[PDB]
Paper text:
NADH-cytochrome b5 reductase (b5R; EC 1.6.2.2) is a flavoprotein containing one FAD molecule. A single-spanning transmembrane helix anchors the protein on the inner surface of the endoplasmic reticulum membrane. b5R mediates electron transfer from NADH to cytochrome b5 (b5). Flavin compounds such as flavin adenine dinucleotide (FAD), flavin mononucleotide (FMN) and riboflavin (vitamin B2) are utilized as cofactors of proteins for various oxidoreductive processes. The isoalloxazine ring is a redox center common to all of these compounds.
The valence electronic structures of FAD as well as the protein environment are experimentally determined and analyzed in order to investigate the properties of FAD in b5R. However, we believe that the result is relevant for two reasons as follows. The second reason is that the valence electrons were clearly observed for both Data I and II, even in the residual maps of the ISAM refinements as well as the deformation maps of the MAM refinements. These multiple results enhance the validity of this study.
Author numbering: 1001 to 1272
The structure:
Amino acid sequence: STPAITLENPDIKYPLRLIDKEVVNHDTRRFRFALPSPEHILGLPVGQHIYLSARIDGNLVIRPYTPVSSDDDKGFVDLVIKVYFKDTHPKFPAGGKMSQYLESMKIGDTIEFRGPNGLLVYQGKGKFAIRPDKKSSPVIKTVKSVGMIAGGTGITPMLQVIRAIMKDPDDHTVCHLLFANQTEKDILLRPELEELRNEHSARFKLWYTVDRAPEAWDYSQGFVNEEMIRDHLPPPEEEPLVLMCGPPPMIQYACLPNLERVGHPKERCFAF
Ligand SMILES: Cc1cc2nc3c(=O)[nH]c(=O)nc-3n(C[C@H](O)[C@H](O)[C@H](O)COP(=O)(O)OP(=O)(O)OC[C@H]3O[C@@H](n4cnc5c(N)ncnc54)[C@H](O)[C@@H]3O)c2cc1C
């Protein structure tokens, strides 16, 4: 038998109750929500995400999230959230709508989840099912390696796939992650990524870049560029799948042009 799934229908919203909220650091939270019973699982295929929706100051707001939990976790779903507070970043004085709304929730409050969503599903042992659009059949392709470029919150789609591969000892897919952030302080999920590197270095390659670097810095500084893609993703001759998730100017200016310069087919670079 298999556990009961929570996300039974992708057009249904499921209000889930907040049970724990961890202050990871000043602006990072881990929120745990209860599933309908302690024996349920979420029902989120690897590669897909959920949406949160709420009425936030009178207007509907919907945003995608990839949990840090998996379908191995019974009874709960965990989201790691960067809270974008007002009056912090000069280009974003209002801060972020859903992340500040999540920060305001009280234990016992509910929020609507929906899913699964997303055009990519990882089928295991290097095989990805990628739809060109939602109403269309997936292209299945099997790769030996996966390049991953994450910026900021775009790490959680990558971590979900990395963790699904590493937990299968007979999955020989090698993942190469290049993870960009504004500063060293702003990096999410660093201990979790470094645990995976400690345990799985043969199949997991980890590199960081930061827009501005600390005094003591072992990795890259600046935006993702051609050199970093040569040095930190599989070469195009190996025909890796390239996955990306990050802010639009990062994808548009830093990632796609440089993936193309290296020779990866741009048309095949998938953005979550
Ligand atoms: C597939 C997928 C999975 C995701 N998973 C996660 C996840 O697990 N965790 C997560 O936290 N997010 C995740 N995101 C991002 C998430 O969807 C939202 O974009 C994020 O929560 C911010 O939404 P918001 O409503 O708070 O901000 P919005 O109101 O939408 O603000 C717009 C943008 O303003 C910028 N911004 C606002 N304030 C600041 C500031 N203080 N500093 C810097 N920039 C700022 C941010 O770049 C923000 O995205 C994911 C996105 C995708 C596509």
